[PDB]
Amino acid sequence: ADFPILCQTCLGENPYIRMTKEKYGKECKICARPFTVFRWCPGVRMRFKKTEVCQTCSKLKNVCQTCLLDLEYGLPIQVRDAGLSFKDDMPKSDVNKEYYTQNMEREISNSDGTRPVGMLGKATSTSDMLLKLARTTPYYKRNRPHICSFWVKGECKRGEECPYRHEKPTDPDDPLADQNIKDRYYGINDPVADKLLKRASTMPRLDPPEDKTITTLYVGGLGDTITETDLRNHFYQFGEIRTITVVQRQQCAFIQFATRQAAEVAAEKSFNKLIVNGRRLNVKWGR
Amino acid sequence: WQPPNVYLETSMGIIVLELYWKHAPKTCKNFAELARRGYYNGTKFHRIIKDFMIQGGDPTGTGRGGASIYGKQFEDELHPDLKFTGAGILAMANAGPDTNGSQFFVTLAPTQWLDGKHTIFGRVCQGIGMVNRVGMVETNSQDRPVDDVKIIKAYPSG
Amino acid sequence: DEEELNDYKLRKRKTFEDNIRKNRTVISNWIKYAQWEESLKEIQRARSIYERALDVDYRNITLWLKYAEMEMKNRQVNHARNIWDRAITTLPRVNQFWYKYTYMEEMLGNVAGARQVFERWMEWQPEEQAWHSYINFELRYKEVDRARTIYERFVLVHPDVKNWIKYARFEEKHAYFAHARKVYERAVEFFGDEHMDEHLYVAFAKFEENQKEFERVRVIYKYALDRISKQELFKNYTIFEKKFGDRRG
Amino acid sequence: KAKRKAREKQLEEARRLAALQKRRELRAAGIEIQKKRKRKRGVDYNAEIPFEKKPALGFYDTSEENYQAL
Amino acid sequence: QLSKQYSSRDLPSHTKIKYRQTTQDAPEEVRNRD
Amino acid sequence: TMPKPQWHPPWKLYRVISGHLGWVRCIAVEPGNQWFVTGSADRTIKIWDLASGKLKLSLTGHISTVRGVIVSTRSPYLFSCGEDKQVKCWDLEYNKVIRHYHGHLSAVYGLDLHPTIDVLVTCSRDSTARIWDVRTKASVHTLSGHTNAVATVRCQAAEPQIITGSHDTTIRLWDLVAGKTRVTLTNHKKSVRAVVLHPRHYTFASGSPDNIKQWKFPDGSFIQNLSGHNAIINTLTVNSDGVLVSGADNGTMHLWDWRTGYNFQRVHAAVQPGSLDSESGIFACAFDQSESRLLTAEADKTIKVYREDDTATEETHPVS
Amino acid sequence: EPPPYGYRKGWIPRLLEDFGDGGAFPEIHVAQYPLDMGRKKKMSNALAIQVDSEGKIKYDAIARQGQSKDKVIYSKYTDLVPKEVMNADDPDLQRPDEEAIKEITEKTRVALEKSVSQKVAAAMPVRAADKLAPAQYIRYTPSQQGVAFNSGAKQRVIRMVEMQKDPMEPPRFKINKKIPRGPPSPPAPVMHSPSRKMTVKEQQE
Amino acid sequence: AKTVTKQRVESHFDLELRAAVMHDILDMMPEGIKQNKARTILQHLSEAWRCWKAN
């Protein structure tokens, strides 16, 4: 390798990062074979991390060789794949998996080291679903240590040097507790991923009306910095518009459309996020 | 002097573009006199954005070449109602306005964004299935495609 | 169908796998594995199967064949065409590949494609019967311009007098007699002095007998006999019989 | 040699039979006990296409193509 | 994946190549000869 | 057709050496032209004086048929190669084996030397070739990719440096340093057992029961066929003067012109007294370094030596 | 057909027919779809149907499928056809001159010997180990750019150190794993002469 | 890749004799197009040897 592949969270904060290398250090639980191991000092009194997957095992799905989440968005791989509608055929059984890994490394040897191989580019339409489920700031709780089992029973007699966060241990009844690393990599029943599914299912999106002839769309929360041509340029080449009523006595709008699916495109993509000159409009189908 | 449909019979197949001088007389004269000049022979498609745009027409083929009939560049001939709303929008693009040179772009789909930044000048009245074929092809990381595609014959309509 | 069936599948699969593990040469096991799969209708399985078998032996006409037969019986017609072109790319001098490609293309109707694949094919100048089926294909259509283009190309890649003859045959039947005259001229002036001989000329005299031009029949007959190598002896008796014919009729 | 192996060609099947008839009645009785697992290439068949090659595509429309079932 | 096993026969031995000298028959004299 | 071929004189049998006890399978000539060396299927390697044909010495190390021998231009070394899967390096100043290259998995069908560097190429029946470092007996590269016995291998200094013809009926030209196949020529229909390189013409020929073919370096482009010799072809060997000897396996050996492809002579020798007629067959041919004598190693345990005929002229032997 | 230039106002052509021989009306405020234009279509697996620089159907792509521009793949008849040469004095019939030859000798010797000596030191196995080389200083430009991560810097400069290998440490991993051999190469094309079927007589002979 | 020692000398001679046969004619002087009965020409070869040995 040249260096690891991991997100900013796993990657660190200080401008000068310190990581030690060992060639052929241990076994990628994916490629199953020896890899290089680079070990990075995450943060002040924060657990030193290490590279935990073959670089090819990484370029396969385009995820973090330490943080394990995708490198573009940073959600569970099950999620990110489905958010691209992506459907990978990676084999599972022992002999099948070894044959797959061998030919995979052969096929990746013909690469230039810039981007993951295969459908990872022909699924690069990062949907606003993924964009919105994407975390914003570095959830740097990751580099805090374990539960110092001594310090959970009382025993951690080393003073403050408990090797692990001497807090209350999580009740493993939580589905967010035991996610086998191999399953999390295979996209195999990640309960955290199902939580992201429930969250991105309950997260607000624009609603559909009943009758097809309701082609009037009310956009609530306009303000008096908007123009009718600006409401147009928001919803104009996204189809054809038939008319628009910019209600200044109520600070809203209403686009009567010329294509129903065009209306759907503009409005559903616009739900609360059509931010032209900074005003939170609400795209709905009018009365 | 407005060559109605200018033929660029490219290597993979023909193209012919009708430019509306009433909408874009200046770059229309540019493209007419330029195709008649034939200095385009050997232009490799300088950008391929699959299903969005096909762009070429540079004697350099890197993205930093190209000169016009007027010097290096001229201003835009901007339109009120002409848009890049669909494939075959033939508009010479700018890296900054009033700097339109030799490189030419040909759309592949609705591109209503570069409207107001590109004077949409006409359409490919020939070769549009071929344009879809071209916009399909595999390009490297730098939009100069892995296929070295150039025009066979550049000339006006009579 | 939960697990009795499923374990019957598991068994038969493990068997076929072990048989091809032992040999992985001779192909009957590869086929029978694959056709068992196709009968259970998992064409993704069967597809990978034929790719692997094709890897171990890419020179097997029966392998290519029944691969594409699966694809056609299941009308992934695009997939099938990819198969056929790959075949005719790697094993061109096999003919039945070209054939089945066309036939399937025909009942598909894309006769433009059929024409161009025949152009491909003829780039190899394959074979007389190949040309002839090309022409029967073209005359399943009106396309007599095509047909004479192909007789043009065929008789002129293959210097045969009887090829000349079949060209004029088609001219006579589809009723282009002036073209028949041109082709008799061309033929005899190409074949000519040395190794040109009786039978193109007897055909010429017969066509002009159809034209009932007896004096020029006489002159062409004896003039060709005399100008070119003459005769040999049994053929000369044939010349005597044909002479009685041409004189009487 | 030959004919012996013909004899166990059936009496083997009785074994999966007596395994089937017991176990289908066994596990349906209210006990889902498994014999046990260590099978290193056994499941390569019922689970995945064992060693897979994807059919290479050429010049045609293969995606929307798909097939009906049994 | 380079193993650490080893062999009695792969021990270093005969580590210089005897080059064909001037008098024996060097490629030079072969360049000349009739 | 073609220009008219040069007239070459004929060749006439003039010596027949008999001392081996099984098929004679390979033959080679010293650099300095004092002695040639034969390796036979009675497992011995004999060393004969080239003037008189007297046997100077016989070395016995192998366990089975010696299937190829060669002698180093740069070092006092003979390299032998056998069906016991072993490749040996005889040092000719003690007459002793000093080095042995282990690692093939079936008979080694042939072997060649690089003229500039000290490396070795060997081809075997496990359908691979190998590149050994002469001096540390280590396999630097395993040229794999054929799918049957790799009948023959030749190496040159120009590029590509390694040409192997096999029994799956294809030829491959290999990049040495990369160690992998550049070009794959599938023009022959039957197994390819002999290939040869012109000394001064960046060209090479490849023989099979179908017909010899001529090709052009470095991308292996067809040049011409050569036909007439319809028999299993065991050897091709090309002179400096455009003579091309093709010796076959049913005994017959034809002589051609390298350039125009015109077979001007056909020799059919007679088997040594007590042989069957189905024990006529030629396994090795070699031009001497004066390129005046032509030695052949035969399936009836003989070495037949042919010389150039000095009293013939274009009017004695018209050219067709 | 398409209304004239300056007289094209008022109508919006929605069926590709009103394009006549083709054309988009940029001043007409619609997405113009003359001859299949405008629509992003289903992502289907047919790879790029290329055409030669003379207008033909280059199946050299189907041959060289998934292969680099290094591979020579003879599948044209113009390779089957016998060239003619009559000059023992052409450029075609001339080898590289010994300057290139000595260059390629030196390059070959070098790369050869390095790979040799690594495989030879493999037969050392008691590595009289050399110590750990000087420390690595590498400048990393993340592709992730953003004010919040790396606490706001666009580069990180990183120290790599080589961790000691313990001498008395046995091998670590089970090397001897067997699997079948990987799928070969893109098969070559069989450039054979026309093959003849034998008479049944011959067959019985 | 084990050597040929003293106990595999006869076995090895026959591996290679009958390999050589199978290369030699039954696949390079055929024209028995079907499936060249090499498995039976090898049976002749072994009976020719038994008959030589028994005179």
Swiss-Prot record, chain B:
GO CC annotation terms, alphabetical: catalytic step 2 spliceosome; nucleoplasm; nucleus; U2-type catalytic step 2 spliceosome
Effect listed in the UniProt record for changing residue 70 to C: In PCH14; uncertain significance; strongly reduced protein levels compared to wild-type after transfection in HEK293T cell line
Catalytic activity reported: [protein]-peptidylproline (omega=180) = [protein]-peptidylproline (omega=0)
Annotated keywords: Disease variant, Intellectual disability, Isomerase, mRNA processing, mRNA splicing, Nucleus, Phosphoprotein, Rotamase, Spliceosome
Regulation of this protein's activity per its record: Inhibited by Cyclosporin A.
Entry annotated with the keyword Isomerase: yes
EC code(s) of this entry: 5.2.1.8
Pfam families xrefs: Pro_isomerase (PF00160)
CDD domains for this protein: cyclophilin_SpCYP2_like
InterPro entries, A to Z: Cyclophilin-like_dom_sf (IPR029000), Cyclophilin-type_PPIase (IPR024936), Cyclophilin-type_PPIase_CS (IPR020892), Cyclophilin-type_PPIase_dom (IPR002130), Cyclophilin_A-like (IPR044666)
Medical condition linked: Pontocerebellar hypoplasia 14: A form of pontocerebellar hypoplasia, a disorder characterized by structural defects of the pons and cerebellum, evident upon brain imaging. PCH14 is a severe autosomal recessive form characterized by progressive microcephaly, and poor or absent psychomotor development with severely impaired intellectual development apparent from birth. Other features may include hypotonia, spastic quadriplegia, and early-onset seizures. Early death may occur in some patients.
Descriptive protein name: Peptidyl-prolyl cis-trans isomerase-like 1
Originating organism: Homo sapiens
Curated annotation (Swiss-Prot), chain D:
Tissue specificity of this protein: Ubiquitously expressed in both fetal and adult tissues.
Annotated coiled-coil segments of the chain: 1-70
Modified residues (Phosphothreonine): 62
Post-translational modification: Phosphorylated on serine and threonine residues. Has no effect on subcellular location nor on homodimerization. Phosphorylated in vitro by CDK2. Phosphorylation enhances interaction with PPP1R8.
Motif Nuclear localization signal: where in chain: 1-70
Cross-link Glycyl lysine isopeptide (Lys-Gly) (interchain with G-Cter in SUMO2): residue positions: 54
Domain of life: Eukaryota
Effect upon mutating residue 62 to A: Abolishes phosphorylation. No effect on homodimerization nor on nuclear localization
Family: Belongs to the CEF1 family.
Subunit structure, as described in the record: Homodimer. Interacts with DAPK3. Component of the precatalytic, catalytic and postcatalytic spliceosome complexes. Part of a spliceosomal 'core' complex consisting of CDC5L, PLRG1, SPF27, CCAP1, CCAP3 and CCAP6. Interacts with PLRG1, Lodestar/TTF2, and NIPP1/PPP1R8. Component of the minor spliceosome, which splices U12-type introns. Within this complex, interacts with SCNM1. Component of the PRP19-CDC5L splicing complex composed of a core complex comprising a homotetramer of PRPF19, CDC5L, PLRG1 and BCAS2, and at least three less stably associated proteins CTNNBL1, CWC15 and HSPA8.
Protein name: Cell division cycle 5-like protein
UniProt organism field: Homo sapiens (Human)
Protein encoded by which gene: CDC5L
Whole-protein residues included: 166 to 235 of 802
From Swiss-Prot, chain F:
Role description: Involved in pre-mRNA splicing as component of the spliceosome. Component of the PRP19-CDC5L complex that forms an integral part of the spliceosome and is required for activating pre-mRNA splicing. As a component of the minor spliceosome, involved in the splicing of U12-type introns in pre-mRNAs.
Family as reported in the entry's similarity comment: Belongs to the WD repeat PRL1/PRL2 family.
Main location: nucleus
Modified residues (Phosphoserine): 18, 208
Protein name, UniProt field: Pleiotropic regulator 1
Organism expressing this protein natively: Homo sapiens (Human)
Subcellular location: Nucleus; Nucleus speckle
Keywords noted in UniProt: Acetylation, mRNA processing, mRNA splicing, Nucleus, Phosphoprotein, Repeat, Spliceosome, WD repeat
From-to range in the entire protein, with total length: 184 to 503 of 514
Assembly and interaction partners: Identified in the spliceosome C complex. Component of the PRP19-CDC5L splicing complex composed of a core complex comprising a homotetramer of PRPF19, CDC5L, PLRG1 and BCAS2, and at least three less stably associated proteins CTNNBL1, CWC15 and HSPA8. Interacts (via its WD40 repeat domain) directly with CDC5L (via its C-terminal); the interaction is required for mRNA splicing but not for spliceosome assembly. Component of the minor spliceosome, which splices U12-type introns. Within this complex, interacts with CRIPT. Also interacts directly in the complex with BCAS2 and PRPF19.
Sequence ranges of the WD repeats: 19-58, 61-100, 103-142, 145-184, 187-227, 228-266, 277-316
Curated annotation (Swiss-Prot), chain H:
Function, in words: Plays a role in pre-mRNA splicing as core component of precatalytic, catalytic and postcatalytic spliceosomal complexes, both of the predominant U2-type spliceosome and the minor U12-type spliceosome. Functions as a scaffold that mediates the ordered assembly of spliceosomal proteins and snRNAs. Required for the assembly of the U4/U6-U5 tri-snRNP complex, a building block of the spliceosome. Functions as a scaffold that positions spliceosomal U2, U5 and U6 snRNAs at splice sites on pre-mRNA substrates, so that splicing can occur. Interacts with both the 5' and the 3' splice site.
Name of the protein this chain belongs to: Pre-mRNA-processing-splicing factor 8
Domain notes from UniProt: The MPN (JAB/Mov34) domain mediates interaction with TSSC4 and SNRNP200. Has structural similarity with deubiquitinating enzymes, but lacks the residues that would bind the catalytic metal ion.
Superkingdom as given in the UniProt entry: Eukaryota
Annotated compartments: Nucleus; Nucleus speckle
Tissues where the protein occurs: Widely expressed.
